[PDB]
């Protein structure tokens, strides 16, 4: 028995699953691709000459695949989540010593999640905001505020942490923030005469829950909103 | 010698040789400068390490303004009196500074025909601007606008030379919080003056 | 001797010495230059001082946009006639412009080297830009946009070397207003490019 | 001697020094660095030139982050095997490398004193950042965001100074298009660190 | 006959017409004015000493008369089209030696154009956007986004083009711009079942049919407009 091109490089599994994370450097590891040899080691058939087919999503020449190894790293060409969730990588290893011809070969799947960071500002999207209250009024959402992240809907760099700038002083208002939507619920915890005609002018400061990363920290300068209760 | 070029606090100072803030009741950070002659300008190359507690602290708040004074005599030599930093700049010595006197300190200084005193009609020459960062502990630069101001001041008759540095942010949040905060090292920062003779 | 080192336009030249502007018929700035060598870098160093009305006039638009031409010949002497700078640079004797020749002024130079004339596929390396201020008269700085342009043109076969620095600003209001327009003085500004050999 | 204080990588070398991307197969790029000792600092200038097609590719995407690792013995030389720049460093001899050993290699390194590794209390202390530009086809500059790391990593027992730049864009268009894309040319950015010594 | 200040500097035409463009440099050649001399060549009558007299648009001290030559340039005051699209400048071409008498000498008019460049990013004028489809719904142009460009109504510099930052995956949508007014008019090319009760969310990037500027490109960080379409 020689080591003749005479069986195909085994896999471990066919359709692969890993995962590498939003704004990675280049050349960051994302997994090793599984393979072993039906024929002897250390010969022509050992040398797994690992080979990427077709990239479903092509347009950018986003990941690496080392033929020597079958590691897959990443391009200089940075990942951004919110335009590609998740990649799949038909890639087929080839025995011998890297003939290239049309003697069909294993054909594994890969499939790449990219996972999210939060390098995205929420922004609210109405620009007047306004709530009205009457005697003897509490616990009341007059108001919700609506925001737009872009990162990764349901989770914690997409979720709005909501807090009080300025006017909150007496401890009027307490934010929840929904979950299914990302609203600005409000809510009312003191009680105001409406004939003493007065006012309960504040303003809030809106930022996910989770921390801003690397390059949208320093750059986050947040305005207020002026939200106008009417008493 | 490529040693006397050279006018420098010292690589990092055993203990803190510098008191910002004026709440501290001793030296409360390490003041890293470097003078150098570069043919008729100085490459002035200066940045802060944050030493005691309360001065580390700055970084937890959103408006911070910090500035360092450095006043020098008619020979250039530093009045520690009336500075901020608290030790006299010296020469060369590997990652050291010398021990000996100072020879010419008096061309590192900024020139008084370049930077006037109390010229009310030449007053925009003695600003310089720029910028310099700090990274967080978490590896995010945040730029802090230094203003430097040359030549402004006499506290009294003895002061010859001044040199005032002030470093300022106006961030959207503070850099860090209570736990996370661990020390204020700014990046290093370069500008250049046009210096007295010798 | 660490004079022959920098090539410089002297310091607060008792008159104008640069006439910017073409709509000014003399000198109408004061501009500050200083070339030192620093190894195989120049350390460039250079801003203006307003001197006319008319140039001073420029801080109550918002609009502005005004640059100085450097032509120099084979040996590194400036073409005057050519020139934004009709005063020929010279080396350091104290604050002022030393009185005799040139010596290697060939150095001081941007190198063809690295920075070719008319070489379409390597334009991109003859531009440096960079950022200089305005203090305003409530000591406001305002930034101005600098772009330095290197050896991009020969005038005629004389010219061997070519140096563009623009000053600009597009900003939302203008710095000043007639009543407060005092003087445009800039901050000073501070590049390197490669050198021609000596 | 003057030609000793500079360490560099060439003006304008013949070939590609640099394999920046671990993609490319062989040299993808001219990288220019250029190291002068100036007094306690040095006077550090880099920049990039694009050469392999996949390399000048770059500026059509919007996402851009590319670096380029330099390390160096215990005496100063660089290890051509795990650096990104692929020939070793020299001193001047022109526009060119000299051909000679090197003559105290050891003092252009990042000091270690300033610049510990591996120490967690002194983190910050080994960060330097900066902008540099790409002048694109029409002539409109796009900033580039630059971080230098200083002696963070000794891949073997054998490196002793790391020097990591980064060149990384976040812009809202690509600078070219695939038509338009001719060379990705990074304007030239100098930073200073303490040196070690001789 | 000698060249005494007897006649007047002959003009090629009365009405001059010449155009420079939006924010060019200092000193950049606008027009030679054109003039003659009806004395002898090389006198002082040929001294042919051209002279604004009126920018009518009078304020800013834009324009430059190169009085030896009559080359009119452009000043360190750089041209902002946006707030003065044309200049007049009625010159006085004066024969003699420069002398400023009453004599009365021939005037010209010189009228300027600006060209407009595209310095001004187009902004999206609303901020809530919403559109609704229901069954078997197709050719549907329901919501029109409002842009809002400065330069120079007409121009490709002002026309609005629009793409999808995101959410149009399957080809639902494809967005026409219409010249009269600068709007988002978007269309509907597939068919959604509304009792699906599903969701047609997605984004837009606005930006000039013609490319910007120098000074705007690199500036220019479009933020989506997350226009909801619901089912």
């Given amino acids: 028995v020689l080591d003749i091109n005479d069986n195909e490089p085994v896999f471990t599994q066919d359709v692969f699953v890993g995962s590498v994370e939003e704004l990675?450097?280049?050349?960051?590891?994302?997994?090793?691709?599984?393979?072993?040899?039906?024929?002897?080691?250390?010969?022509?058939?050992?040398?797994?000459?690992?080979?990427?087919?077709?990239?479903?999503?092509?347009?950018?020449?986003?990941?690496?695949?080392?033929?020597?190894?079958?590691?897959?790293?990443?391009?200089?060409?940075?990942?951004?989540?919110?335009?590609?969730?998740?990649?799949?990588?038909?890639?087929?290893?080839?025995?011998?010593?890297?003939?290239?011809?049309?003697?069909?070969?294993?054909?594994?799947?890969?499939?790449?999640?990219?996972?999210?960071?939060?390098?995205?500002?929420?922004?609210?999207?109405?620009?007047?905001?306004?709530?009205?209250?009457?005697?003897?009024?509490?616990?009341?959402?007059?108001?919700?505020?609506?925001?737009?992240?872009?990162?990764?809907?349901?989770?914690?760099?997409?979720?709005?942490?909501?807090?009080?700038?300025?006017?909150?002083?007496?401890?009027?208002?307490?934010?929840?923030?929904?979950?299914?939507?990302?609203?600005?619920?409000?809510?009312?915890?003191?009680?105001?005469?409406?004939?003493?005609?007065?006012?309960?002018?504040?303003?809030?400061?809106?930022?996910?829950?989770?921390?801003?990363?690397?390059?949208?920290?320093?750059?986050?300068?947040?305005?207020?909103?002026?939200?106008?209760?009417?008493? | 010698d490529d040693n006397i070029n050279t006018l420098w606090t010292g690589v990092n100072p055993t203990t803190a040789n510098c008191q910002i803030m004026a709440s501290s009741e001793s030296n409360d950070c390490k003041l890293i400068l470097t003078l150098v002659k570069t043919g008729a300008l100085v490459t002035a190359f200066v940045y802060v390490i944050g030493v005691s507690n309360d001065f580390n602290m700055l970084t937890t708040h959103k408006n911070i303004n910090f500035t360092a004074e450095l006043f020098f005599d008619s020979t250039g030599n530093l009045l520690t009196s009336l500075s901020s930093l608290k030790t006299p700049l010296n020469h060369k010595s590997g990652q050291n500074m010398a021990t000996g006197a100072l020879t010419n300190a008096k061309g590192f200084m900024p020139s008084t025909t370049a930077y006037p005193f109390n010229v009310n009609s030449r007053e925009k020459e003695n600003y310089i601007y720029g910028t310099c960062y700090y990274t967080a502990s978490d590896h995010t630069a945040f730029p802090i606008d230094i203003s430097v101001m040359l030549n402004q001041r006499a506290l009294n008759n003895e002061t010859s030379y001044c040199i005032r540095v002030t470093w300022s942010w106006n961030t959207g949040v503070a850099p860090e919080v209570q736990t996370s905060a661990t020390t204020l090292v700014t990046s290093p920062f370069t500008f250049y003056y046009i210096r007295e003779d010798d």
């Fill in chain 1, 24 to 231: 990675s450097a280049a050349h960051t590891l994302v997994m090793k691709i599984n393979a072993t040899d039906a024929d002897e080691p250390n010969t022509l058939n050992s040398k797994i000459s690992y080979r990427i087919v077709s990239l479903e999503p092509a347009y950018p020449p986003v990941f690496y695949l080392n033929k020597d190894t079958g590691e897959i790293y990443t391009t200089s060409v940075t990942l951004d989540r919110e335009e590609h969730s998740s990649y799949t990588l038909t890639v087929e290893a080839r025995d011998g010593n890297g003939e290239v011809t049309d003697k069909p070969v294993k054909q594994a799947q890969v499939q790449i999640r990219i996972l999210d960071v939060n390098d995205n500002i929420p922004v609210v999207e109405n620009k007047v905001l306004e709530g009205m209250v009457e005697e003897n009024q509490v616990n009341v959402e007059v108001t919700r505020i609506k925001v737009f992240d872009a990162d990764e809907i349901g989770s914690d760099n997409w979720l709005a942490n909501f807090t009080f700038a300025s006017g909150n002083e007496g401890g009027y208002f307490h934010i929840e923030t929904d979950a299914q939507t990302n609203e600005g619920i409000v809510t009312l915890i003191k009680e105001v005469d409406y004939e003493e005609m007065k006012n309960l002018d504040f303003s809030v400061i809106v930022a996910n829950k989770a921390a801003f990363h690397k390059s949208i920290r320093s750059k986050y300068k947040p305005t207020p909103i002026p939200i106008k209760v009417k008493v």
